[PDB]
Each structure stands twice: as C-alpha cells, then as structure tokens.
Scaffold this active site. Structure first.
Site, mmCIF file in Angstrom:
data_model
loop_
_atom_site.group_PDB
_atom_site.id
_atom_site.type_symbol
_atom_site.label_atom_id
_atom_site.label_comp_id
_atom_site.label_asym_id
_atom_site.label_seq_id
_atom_site.Cartn_x
_atom_site.Cartn_y
_atom_site.Cartn_z
ATOM 1 N N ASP A 37 0.778 -1.239 0.000
ATOM 2 C CA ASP A 37 0.000 0.000 0.000
ATOM 3 C C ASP A 37 0.818 1.303 0.000
ATOM 4 O O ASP A 37 1.347 1.744 1.046
ATOM 5 C CB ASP A 37 -0.969 -0.007 1.191
ATOM 6 C CG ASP A 37 -1.892 1.196 1.204
ATOM 7 O OD1 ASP A 37 -2.009 1.883 0.168
ATOM 8 O OD2 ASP A 37 -2.502 1.458 2.258
ATOM 9 N N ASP A 222 -1.914 5.444 -5.445
ATOM 10 C CA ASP A 222 -2.304 4.629 -4.306
ATOM 11 C C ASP A 222 -2.620 3.188 -4.729
ATOM 12 O O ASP A 222 -3.732 2.890 -5.152
ATOM 13 C CB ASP A 222 -3.532 5.271 -3.671
ATOM 14 C CG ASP A 222 -3.865 4.691 -2.324
ATOM 15 O OD1 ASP A 222 -3.281 3.644 -1.960
ATOM 16 O OD2 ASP A 222 -4.715 5.297 -1.630
HETATM 17 C C1 LIG Z 1 -6.526 -2.533 3.795
HETATM 18 C C2 LIG Z 1 -6.910 -1.274 3.012
HETATM 19 C C3 LIG Z 1 -6.124 -0.077 3.550
HETATM 20 C C4 LIG Z 1 -6.471 1.183 2.790
HETATM 21 C C5 LIG Z 1 -7.703 1.711 2.845
HETATM 22 C C6 LIG Z 1 -7.963 2.939 2.080
HETATM 23 O O1 LIG Z 1 -9.054 3.457 2.099
HETATM 24 N N1 LIG Z 1 -6.941 3.500 1.331
HETATM 25 C C7 LIG Z 1 -5.681 2.920 1.294
HETATM 26 N N2 LIG Z 1 -4.691 3.501 0.538
HETATM 27 N N3 LIG Z 1 -5.426 1.832 1.967
#
Ligand SMILES: CCCc1cc(=O)[nH]c(N)n1
Length: 379
Positions: A37, A222
């Site tokens: 992420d 992202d």
């Molecule tokens: C596990 C999902 C984590 C997450 C949730 C989200 O809303 N945005 C990002 N970039 N990461």
C-alpha cells in the site's frame, strides 16, 4: 542488464481486494500475506483471532519480538484499526535477500478492515513519514530497509489485470516489465506519493476544467485503492463525457454509480464503444508534461457472477472522492510504475502485462508544452 527474476510475479490477489506480498515475521519466522500500500505508511499485522483471518502474528512465539510498550491507531477511508506497537525481524521470501529489524503494529481491534476471503493478514505502508501513526517519529518499513541494508532507495510496481497478479521489484527497475520509455513526474511532496495533473482528455477531448480541479485537494498514486477516484466536479464531467462516447448502448443509472453490473455474452464486450482516458502529468522539464492513457479494460473491472459463464460482467471502477484524486489500481494496471524515492519522482511506462485488445493499447506519450503547471497545485 535489468532482470530481477526472484522478484517477478511475487504479488497475488482477488479482484477488488488488493495486491499482497508474502512476508515473514519473527524467529522462527511466520509466513503472512501483507497488502502492498503506497497510500499509507504503517506496517501492521493481525496479532489476534478474527472472523476473516486464516492466520495471525503469534508474537509470544517470536524470540526476537520486542514490545514498544505503546499504542497506535490508524484510520483509513476504508476501515480502521488500533494495535500495540513493537519491533521484530522482517523478511520477504521473494524479495531482496535480507532480513531487517522494523516497526510493527500488532492489530488487536479493527473495524471493516480485514476483508473476507482476501488471503492477506497485514499491510505494508510504503508511503512516507509525514503521515505515519501515531506520528512522523515512527520510521516506516522502506526507510528501515534502506537504513539497515544496501538496497537502493527505490521500488517499482507492475499490477496486472484479468485471482490477479503482479510484481513488486524492491531496489530496482526490471526491463521485462515495460515497453517503450519511462516518463517521470515529480513527487510534489514526501508524504503521500503526490503528483500533479495538468490536463484531462476523454477520447482526446479536453475535459476543459481549471487544472486546480484535478488536484483538489491533492492527487496521489495509491496501490491500496481499487478505483480511479476523482473529485466530485471532475467525476461528474468525466461520467458525462464517457456516457456520451458510449451512447450507442445505454446502461442502468446504478452502473455509473458503481452500484450495478453490466454484462455481455462471453467475448462480445464492446470495448471499442468505450472511450480512452488520458491524464497529463507535470514533467521534469520546465513547462513540459507527458500523458498516460488507460482503456475501458482498466476502468471496467471484471466481476465473476454466480449465474453462469456465457456472460462476462463488469463494474464501473471510476468513483467520486472528497479527499482528492486517487490514481488507484485501475490506473496502475496500465503501467509499470517506478517510485523513485531517491530522486523524488514517479516513473510511468506502458505495462507489458496490461489487458488490452488488438486495436488499442495503454499509452505513455511526451513531451507536451504545458505552461504554468505549478498553478495546478492546491495551497
Ligand atoms: C486494507 C486497506 C487499507 C487502505 C484503505 C484505504 O481506504 N486506502 C488505502 N490507501 N489503503
């Protein structure tokens, strides 16, 4: 040459549920699948039972487990968890041959975070310090890795379409993962991987907004987000423009909201009636930009459906946002993306694995003379 064969095809996933890498933590090491992420900056792992976890971090079993004797809470757009800080030795079996002591959040409580049947039990925050929880004092995984190892300050991602797959190449750029040239946009600030969009076209027609609209109140790359998310005003004009370009077929109202599947007899999806989407991004050279172009194959996410084969079904994967533009997996699935942290920049080339058809391909073209690009940013 340019070949990182140990790291090719190290990511897996289900569609709409993210891309994950296999990591280990502790001594003896415990295999866990961790979500990759770039939208967050916290390494965190499930450390207790949960209805949607097949396995979890048993920290008492780790002989190298350290307790930071502290608490940490991270909210997202999708879900939130709170956990107990600490450190342990971490490694990636199909990564660079190293082991590193790093920061870990042991998740005890979480709400709408762990997805049912995702197959991942933690998350790797690859974005910068300025947004780490509880604060910027907590050194993120990649910053630890570069501190304690000789690995270049740089990772690249190739996310492939369709269970999906992909490649996270830590410390280099694999030449087999793209075709044509790498074009670089500047990371505007080291917090999110924030870029600047200077123009938007649908099938070459200028969306025709003030460019600030495209970057209100930020634009970010992202990997942890599925859709191309756009600011409300930008989203509403794109959907209007895309509706018009696809007008030889009408779809339900709910389809354009992401609420409804559209379907066609297998092999008969009319890709060619759907427009191409171009995002022009600030360049390295003064008054210059390049553009990336994705196909309906990227923004129409395929959905297996429960009735029969014989129909291929899709979801519209462009959605509205209030936190800015998020160039999520639908954008990244057309390109090899190179997070060149060492040189404060992000590279885009055509992905060698992207889904397309005989007649159109995802594109990365430049340069273009584009003035006052600094103006496009929010302040
Ligand atoms: C596990 C999902 C984590 C997450 C949730 C989200 O809303 N945005 C990002 N970039 N990461």
């Amino acid at each position: 040459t340019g070949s990182f064969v140990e790291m090719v095809d190290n990511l897996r996933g289900k569609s709409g549920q993210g891309y994950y890498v296999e990591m280990t933590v502790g001594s003896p090491p415990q295999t866990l699948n961790i979500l990759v992420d770039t939208g967050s900056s916290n390494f965190a792992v499930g450390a207790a039972p949960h209805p949607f976890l097949h396995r979890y971090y048993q920290r008492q079993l780790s002989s190298t487990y350290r307790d930071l004797r502290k608490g940490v809470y991270v909210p997202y757009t999708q879900g939130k968890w709170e956990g107990e800080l600490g450190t342990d030795l971490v490694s990636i079996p199909h990564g660079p041959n190293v082991t590193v002591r790093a920061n870990i959040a042991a998740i005890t409580e979480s709400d709408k975070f762990f997805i049912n049947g995702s197959n991942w039990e933690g998350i790797l925050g690859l974005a910068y310090a300025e947004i780490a929880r509880p604060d910027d004092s907590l050194e993120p995984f990649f910053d630890s890795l570069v501190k304690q190892t000789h690995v270049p300050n740089l990772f690249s991602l190739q996310l492939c379409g369709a269970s999906v797959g992909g490649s996270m190449i830590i410390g280099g750029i694999d030449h087999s993962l793209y075709t044509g040239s790498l074009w670089y946009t500047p990371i505007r600030r080291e917090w999110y991987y924030e870029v600047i969009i200077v123009r938007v076209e649908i099938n070459g027609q200028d969306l025709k907004m003030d460019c600030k609209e495209y970057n209100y109140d930020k634009s970010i790359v992202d990997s942890g987000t599925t859709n191309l998310r756009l600011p409300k005003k930008v989203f509403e004009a794109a959907v209007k423009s895309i509706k018009a370009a696809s007008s030889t077929e009408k779809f339900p109202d709910g389809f354009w909201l992401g609420e409804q599947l559209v379907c066609w007899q297998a092999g008969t999806t009319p890709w060619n009636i759907f427009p191409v989407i171009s995002l022009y991004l600030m360049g390295e050279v003064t008054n210059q930009s390049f553009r990336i172009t994705i196909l309906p194959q990227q923004y129409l996410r395929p959905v297996e459906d429960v009735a029969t084969s014989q129909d291929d079904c899709y979801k519209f994967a462009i959605s509205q946002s209030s936190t800015g533009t998020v160039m999520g997996a639908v954008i990244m699935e057309g390109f090899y993306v190179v997070f060149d942290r060492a040189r404060k920049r992000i590279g885009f080339a055509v992905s060698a694995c992207h889904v397309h058809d005989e007649f159109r391909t995802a594109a990365v073209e430049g340069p273009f003379v584009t003035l006052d690009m600094e103006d496009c940013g929010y302040n």
